[PDB]
Design a protein around this nucleic acid. Structure first.
Ligand SMILES: [Mg+2]
Ligand SMILES: [Zn+2]
Ligand SMILES: [Zn+2]
Lengths: 1334, 99, 49, 83
RNA sequence: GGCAUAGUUGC
DNA sequence: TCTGAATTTACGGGCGCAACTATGCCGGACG
DNA sequence: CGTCCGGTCTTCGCCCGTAAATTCAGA
């Protein structure tokens, strides 16, 4: 019916064309009788009949009179839907200014006339004069006059001279402007002016003028002359208990504006003096402003009980607007709600639906079945039968519920698993019975949580629920490959209790012929559930070509393990049931089952494992008692000696040996050590609490203690909570962050005295407040991310590109936090990966690195792999399937169409709303140095002369196990590439001084130095040797601040020493703040220090990284390579100059004086090499190093936080978000295309233009990508609808209207708002048909 | 609480909110995102077009279900018509172009 | 409220997350039965017609 | 009854075209004129369509051929009564 | 049958 | 005495989702 | 009870971004 939406300014003629009648009277109803007034805001002859096919006068009341209009009162007899659609208009007695275009910041009227917003506001609100047609006088065009100056001009310039007041003057000024002349003049001024601020102002104003001329709109229409009126039914008056009416805000605003309008018209009729009519026009202007975005100027005019009235802009903007309240999310019929319940008898693919809710939801289907069987001819009879709840309706409900999946959806649907489909099962009650396993998916415990039901109706909806939304198909989370139906709390405890061994139990050592008789023994009570025995096992392995090969052996395990093994399917090895089976072990069991067998075996396995876990947890009777929280009886000595150490530290302090701060630190340190040691003693005494032996000598065993069993099993609780139960509950901090000196020394088993509880409640209140005020930030972040990556959809099957990012294991400085296994899993390789030995193609170029390939890759000790990434995919309007890779929700490649932007946004945002000197080598491995330029000095220690030298600890297989950063002037006791001994530090330096290490050997002659002004003389009395310290330009005297001292090495004769490798002399230009202990004329060596130069969060960090905020102290980088030189004498701050060998020599930079520099004056640096220290700006990274550098930086930085919080999300989601960030590119050279010089255009658009031009003879236009934050990336979208639904509705709509933008509605939010099939899943075929047909 | 079909609002022809009045649950924005992350297109369209505020759509859906046929006419949501009229109330001319 | 003989132990998963398993004795004795008084009012407004 | 659709998706490795073709088959079975090609076991048209795809006797192409043949038969028989 | 306030529940 | 830049200051926008109970309200001042 | 026009006192958060006004640093 339509494939695009346009916006543009509303000309008065077009506004009249919309309207079907003028509104003149500010009346609604009689308030005695409820017929509409003559021509009020609620009228009949203007907007339509009150009823359907019934006129106002009652003369004509039937369908036969469709179209005729009566003469008595002129109401066109038709439906009321027209009353819901027909609009009116108001003929304003004076022109009025549109408030959006006046105060859009920037103001369109403000910069279309190039006049300040203050001046335009002053002249619009009838308080300042503006001249028009200045003529041969002493006035300009846009100049502002006051009443005094206006009268002076009137008495001096009484000849032809125009200077009006209010909206009329603005309308005249706009009408007196031709776009082309101004545009050309502005282009010329832009070219010639050479300014940086005026050039920006111009290239904005020129852009506005080009936007106006390009579209069909005209500037003069931004001043209203006819006010559109909303249809009556969209601002209805609902009668209440009594004759009163519900005054809708729009009605009050319309009444005010029309009232002031009629007052102004009447005053104009009798020609009132100027002051009164100007005041009336000002009142009308204010009323119209209030009717539009109310609250921009002055105060929101209130109507009743001192609350601002909603205006139209306030009605289509914000959380309460029609966008986020009735378009992107709507109330839905065929829905319900209730409290949930466990119901553990259900299978994984069904949920227990209450009978009453089932009857209420499926009423139309029951009607249909009743009529199909003929039990009720008329719908009224079926409705009455259903209401009376006969005995036959229940059979109908059972017949229809058979294969009709329903959707269960908990309130905060953070991630896609928050909504899943189940087959209903009729349950007597009033509460939904939900399968226990999916509780982890919903994050829904059973402490009063409520879930909503939804009933799909269409065949497509039912098939979607069955094939996409059933819990059976949602086994693996979309964020990570781990299963999301891992048994949670009671199943895991049951299995842990089952699969365990004690030293001796009933019937220990007997040999069993199979699991079946093991169960027979346990049920009969002959042998305990946990008794070491020998069992004959038949484990089927599928090492053959898809055939299960049996194997019979005699395994030594326990009765419980065999009973469990009776449940496991054929294809799994027995070794996954020979262990204790904690939570992680069970999750790995399920994951391996999915990987090896398929889906149906894993679903049946989940059902059976839940059943057996519950059954044997019940049989275990694993309870908890106050005698189970055993105190460590030996903590008496520990607490006593800790008290003694703090007492002795106080003894030292009162003697005055130690001050207050160091005592505070030492006390905290000793108490932390005591707490850790008490916790360790408790945990040891608990895990080894039980010692059982009756057949001879004693033998220790892992305990049965309820708390320890329930913690080790991983069901609930961890080291922290178990520690807090028995051991001292640790260190608590005051809200200021100051940790209290005396922490809570009593656990929960012993009572917490009053002050300990007071500290504990500090902590708990802070935690709860942090939760309640961090959920807001998490919600905002996930909303922004979803609204960025929503249009991104997998369109192509393979982009056919040879680019990628070198995925490598990431080591923060300790052990391997994330192995290559998880970082290259399910990502198609970019280039062929050779064997580490010699050029053997181990894996092809374009294979999906599934589990076997990754395991083989690990087996061959491969450390570097390059894999196609979403960010480096050149597909237009989407990303190819191969670049994305594995689905991570299924075991296969991503399908063609499945939307990944929303999946990535939800996967990133879900964890947010829940939670968020010496190099001591640790392993035996080789040492290799990358980007190093070292020199051996006299003392035989290596000193490095580079800056980005990272020390890599290589192993015998060639992999790097540890990485560390080596600063400038670091001492290494070993050589490069020579295997070192792990256990002792390999690198040492001073983190408090920056050396001036040399490159040659000789003597010390201070050249270009004059004592008195260049340096300052310090005579240290406590050392006896003076110092020659250089002070800065503003710190040293005014005698020698124009020259920079140079330190040069000479021979025994006095001549200079040449640099090794270059012809120039080797001189070092010392900066200020240099501790040069050496005096003049002292011999030195190579690589010897001459002088010593002295010197975040959780969710906010992720938000700042994704918004691409510029850090406060960014590390300045070098745009282009070349030699480095200094410039002017610090005019404002130090200046730098970089000159390439044959490129742009005069490239310079402006560097602050107060920040320490990094590189010296004799280095040839490469682009992207750090020139200072501090956080690296993402914009600089993208501009200099490239796209891969910035995407890798962002991925690593966010993964740092998400791992520090103990969360796991695959890198695909971060990569696609980063891709969506850098969606805009700025042109630099026009090339042979038609783009402008420095406009910002979509990367895909310029790419396709260049692709078309290269195939032709012309030359494409080179572009420069720019990194945009998530907010700016989503706000600046090709289609205005998405951004308008996002924040800043007023500004986005103003932009679209001014530029006359056009919508292709190719996104997801946009189709959602329009209300058609999504171009993501099953609707992708329909949109393919759309693209085919046109 | 449950609801097949009952009274609707006035400004936007959507189901009422609450249980004191026989209303329906709110398919919030993140719920729509949950469907979009899925391959659920037809279910989403049925959710926010037929079952919410498409007067012709919901009437035809009800009658078809009564007849035993599970098929829908997408139509256009009336809430979008409300938004169009509200933007037109201003000087912003927004209209749906001919296909 | 009331107090009743409670036993801490997992029972066939019917107390999975925090759910509570109630014996039919508690219902029989009617010790959690609660009386709710609801007020309903109809008004005769002097409306037109 | 049905628990999974993994076999059907294995036979149509798209996971979305499966939904559309199954919906078309269910529509043809509900309006419907046609009858199940698999022994109906008291299941709704959705389950019948998915199982019938599982048997491997229907996909997009087979259904398109059947529809083309039906339209050809309508054209022929409608023509015989006309001329 | 829409707004405002208060309180409450799950996160 | 002018003039471009960087800085500072002013001011516009955002601050999660879902659900339930109650009350009070269309306005208080002239024929 | 029936109609009919509308403005003193209130601020009081945190963060970010962008545009307007002020101030360097010269020529
Ligand atoms: Mg809960
Ligand atoms: Zn009439
Ligand atoms: Zn690609």
């Amino acid at each position: 019916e339509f494939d695009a939406i346009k916006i543009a300014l509303a000309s008065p003629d077009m506004i009249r064309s919309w309207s079907f009648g003028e509104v003149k009277k500010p009346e609604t109803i009689n308030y005695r009788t409820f017929k509409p007034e003559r021509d009020g805001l609620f009228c009949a002859r203007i907007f339509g009949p009150v009823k359907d096919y019934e006129c106002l006068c009652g003369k004509y009341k039937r369908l036969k009179h469709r179209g005729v209009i009566c003469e008595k009162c002129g109401v066109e007899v038709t439906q009321t839907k027209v009353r819901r659609e027909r609009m009116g208009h108001i003929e304003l007695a004076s022109p009025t200014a549109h408030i959006w275009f006046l105060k859009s910041l920037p103001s369109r009227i403000g910069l279309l006339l190039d006049m300040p917003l203050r001046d335009i506001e002053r002249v619009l609100y009838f308080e300042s004069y503006v001249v028009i047609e200045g003529g041969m006088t002493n006035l300009e065009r846009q100049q502002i006059l006051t009443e005094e100056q206006y009268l002076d001009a009137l008495e001096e310039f009484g000849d032809e001279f125009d200077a009006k007041m209010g909206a009329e003057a603005i309308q005249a000024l706009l009408k007196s402007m031709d776009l082309e002349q101004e545009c050309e003049q502005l282009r010329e001024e832009l070219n010639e002016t050479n300014s940086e601020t005026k050039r920006k102002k111009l290239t904005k104003r020129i852009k506005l003028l080009e936007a106006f001329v390009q579209s069909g709109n005209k500037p003069e229409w931004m001043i209203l002359t006819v006010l559109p009126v909303l249809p009556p039914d969209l601002r209805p008056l609902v009668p209440l208990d009594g004759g009163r009416f519900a005054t809708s805000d729009l009605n009050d605003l319309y009444r005010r504006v029309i009232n002031r309008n009629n007052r102004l018209k009447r005053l104009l009729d009798l020609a009132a003096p100027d002051i009164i009519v100007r005041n009336e026009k000002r009142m009308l202007q204010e009323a119209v402003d209030a009717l539009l975005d109310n609250g921009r100027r002055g105060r929101a005019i209130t109507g009743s009980n001192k609350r601002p009235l909603k205006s139209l802009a306030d009605m289509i903007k914000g959380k309460q607007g029609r966008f986020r309240q009735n378009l992107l999310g709507k109330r839905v019929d065929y829905s319900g709600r209730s409290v949930i319940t466990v119901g553990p008898y259900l299978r994984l693919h069904q949920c227990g639906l209450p009978k009453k809710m089932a009857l209420e939801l499926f009423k139309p289907f029951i009607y249909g079945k009743l009529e199909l069987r003929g039990l009720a001819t008329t719908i009224k009879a079926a409705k009455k039968m259903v209401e009376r709840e006969e005995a036959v309706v229940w059979d109908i409900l059972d017949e229809v519920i058979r294969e009709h999946p329903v959707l269960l959806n908990r309130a905060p649907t953070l991630h896609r698993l928050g909504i899943q489909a189940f087959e209903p099962v009729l349950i007597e009650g009033k509460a939904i019975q939900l399968h226990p396993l999916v509780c982890a998916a919903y994050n829904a415990d059973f402490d009063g949580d409520q879930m909503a039901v939804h009933v799909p109706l269409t065949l497509e909806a039912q098939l979607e629920a069955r094939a996409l939304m059933m819990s059976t198909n949602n086994i693996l989370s979309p964020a990570n490959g781990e299963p999301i139906i891992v048994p949670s709390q009671d199943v895991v405890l049951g299995l842990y209790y089952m699969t365990r061994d004690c030293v001796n139990a009933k019937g220990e050592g007997m040999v069993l012929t199979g699991p079946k008789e093991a169960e027979r023994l346990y049920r009969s009570g002959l042998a305990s559930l946990h008794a070491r025995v020998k069992v004959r096992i038949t484990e089927y392995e599928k090492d053959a070509n898809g055939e299960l090969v049996a194997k019979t052996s005699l395994k030594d395990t326990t009765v419980g393990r065999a009973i469990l093994w009776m449940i496991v399917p054929k294809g799994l090895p027995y070794s996954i049931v020979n262990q204790a089976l904690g939570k992680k072990a069970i999750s790995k069991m399920l994951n391996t089952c999915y990987r090896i067998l398929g889906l149906k075996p894993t679903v049946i396995f989940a059902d059976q494992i839940m059943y057996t876990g519950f059954a044997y947890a019940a049989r275990s009777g694993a309870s908890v008692g106050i005698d189970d929280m055993v105190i460590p009886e030996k903590k008496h000595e520990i607490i006593s000696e800790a008290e003694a150490e703090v007492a002795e530290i106080q003894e030292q302090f009162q003697s005055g040996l130690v001050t207050a701060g160091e005592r505070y630190n030492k006390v905290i340190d000793i108490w932390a050590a005591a707490n850790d040691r008490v916790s360790k003693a408790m945990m040891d005494n608990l895990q080894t609490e039980t010692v059982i032996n009756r057949d001879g000598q004693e033998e220790k065993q892992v305990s049965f203690n309820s708390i320890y069993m329930m913690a080790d099993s991983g069901a609930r609780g961890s080291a922290a909570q178990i520690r807090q139960l028995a051991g001292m509950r640790g260190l608590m901090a005051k809200p200021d962050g100051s940790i209290i000196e005396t922490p809570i020394t009593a656990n929960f088993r012993e009572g917490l005295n009053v002050l300990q509880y007071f500290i504990s409640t500090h902590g708990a209140r802070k935690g709860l407040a942090d939760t309640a005020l961090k959920t807001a930030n998490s919600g905002y972040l996930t909303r922004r991310l979803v609204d960025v990556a929503q249009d991104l959809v997998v369109t192509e099957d393979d982009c056919g590109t040879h680019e990628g990012i070198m995925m490598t294991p990431v080591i923060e400085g300790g052990d391997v936090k994330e192995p290559l296994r998880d970082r290259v899993l399910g990502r198609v390789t970019a280039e062929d990966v050779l064997k580490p030995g010699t050029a053997d193609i181990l894996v092809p170029r374009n294979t999906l690195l599934h589990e076997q390939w990754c395991d083989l890759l690990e087996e061959n000790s491969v450390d570097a792999v390059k894999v196609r990434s979403v960010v480096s995919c050149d597909t237009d309007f989407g990303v190819c399937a191969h670049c994305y890779g594995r689905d991570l929700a299924r075991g296969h490649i991503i399908n063609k169409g499945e939307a990944i932007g929303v999946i990535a946004a939800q996967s990133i945002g879900e964890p947010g709303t829940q939670l968020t000197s010496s190099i001591q080598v640790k392993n035996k491995g080789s040492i290799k140095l990358s980007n190093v330029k070292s020199v051996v000095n006299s003392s035989g220690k290596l000193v490095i002369t580079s800056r980005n030298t990272e020390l890599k600890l290589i192993d015998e297989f060639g992999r790097t196990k540890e990485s560390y950063k080596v600063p400038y002037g670091a001492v290494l006791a070993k050589g490069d590439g020579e295997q070192v001994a792990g256990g002792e530090t390999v690198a040492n330096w001073d983190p408090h001084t920056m050396p001036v290490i040399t490159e040659v050997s000789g003597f010390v002659r201070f050249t270009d130095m004059i004592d008195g002004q260049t340096i300052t003389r310090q005579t240290d009395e406590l050392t006896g040797l003076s110092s020659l310290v250089v002070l800065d330009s503003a710190e040293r005297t005014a005698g020698g601040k124009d020259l920079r001292p140079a330190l040069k090495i000479v021979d025994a004769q006095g001549n200079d020493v040449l640099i090794p490798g270059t012809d120039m002399p080797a001189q070092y230009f010392l900066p200020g703040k240099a501790i040069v202990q050496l005096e003049d004329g002292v011999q030195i060596s190579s690589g010897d220090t001459l002088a010593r130069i002295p010197q975040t969060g959780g969710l906010p960090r992720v938000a700042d990284l994704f918004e691409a905020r510029r850090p406060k102290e960014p590390a300045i980088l070098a745009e282009i390579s070349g030699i480095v030189s200094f410039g002017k004498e610090t005019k404002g701050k130090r200046r730098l100059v970089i000159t390439p060998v044959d490129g742009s020599d005069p490239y310079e930079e402006m560097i602050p004086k107060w920040r320490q520099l990094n590189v010296f004056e004799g280095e040839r640096v490469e682009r992207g090499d750090v020139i200072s220290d501090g956080p690296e700006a993402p914009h600089d990274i993208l501009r200099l190093r490239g796209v891969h550098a910035v995407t890798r930086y962002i991925v690593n930085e966010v993964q740092d936080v998400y791992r520090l919080q103990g969360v796991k999300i695959n890198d695909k989601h971060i990569e696609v978000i980063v891709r969506q960030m850098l969606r805009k590119a700025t042109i630099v050279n026009a090339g042979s295309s038609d783009f402008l010089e420095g406009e910002q255009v979509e990367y895909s658009r310029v790419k396709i233009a260049n692709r078309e031009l290269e195939a032709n003879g012309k030359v494409g236009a080179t572009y420069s990508r720019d990194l945009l934050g998530i907010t700016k990336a989503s706000l600046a979208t090709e289609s205005f609808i998405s951004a308008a639904s996002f924040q800043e509705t007023t500004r986005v709509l103003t932009e679209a209207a001014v530029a006359g933008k056009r919508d292709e509605l190719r996104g997801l939010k946009e189709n959602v708002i329009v209300g058609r099939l999504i171009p993501a899943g099953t609707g992708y075929a329909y949109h393919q048909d759309r693209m085919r047909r046109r | 609480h449950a609801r097949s079909t009952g009274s609707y609002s006035l400004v936007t022809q959507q189901p009422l909110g609450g249980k004191a009045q026989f209303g329906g649950q709110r398919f919030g924005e993140m719920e729509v995102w949950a469907l979009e992350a899925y391959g659920a297109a037809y279910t989403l369209q049925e959710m926010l077009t037929v079952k919410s505020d498409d007067v012709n759509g919901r009437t035809k859906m009800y009658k078809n279900i009564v007849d035993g046929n599970h098929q829908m006419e997408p139509g256009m949501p009336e809430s979008f018509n409300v938004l169009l009229k509200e933007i037109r109330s201003l000087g912003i001319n927004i209209e749906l172009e001919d296909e | 409220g009331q107090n009743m003989r409670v036993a801490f132990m997992p029972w066939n998963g019917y107390n999975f997350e925090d759910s509570i398993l109630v014996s039919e004795r508690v219902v029989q004795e009617d010790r959690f039965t609660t009386i709710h008084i609801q007020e309903l009012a109809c008004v005769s407004r002097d409306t037109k017609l | 009854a049905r628990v999974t659709v993994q076999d059907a998706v294995e036979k149509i490795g798209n996971r979305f075209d499966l939904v559309l073709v199954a919906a078309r088959r269910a529509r043809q079975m509900q309006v419907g004129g046609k009858d199940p090609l698999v022994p109906e076991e008291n299941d709704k048209t959705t389950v019948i369509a998915l199982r019938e795809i599982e048997e491997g006797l229907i996909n997009n192409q087979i259904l398109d051929v059947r529809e083309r043949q039906e339209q050809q038969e309508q054209e022929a028989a409608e023509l015989q009564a006309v001329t």
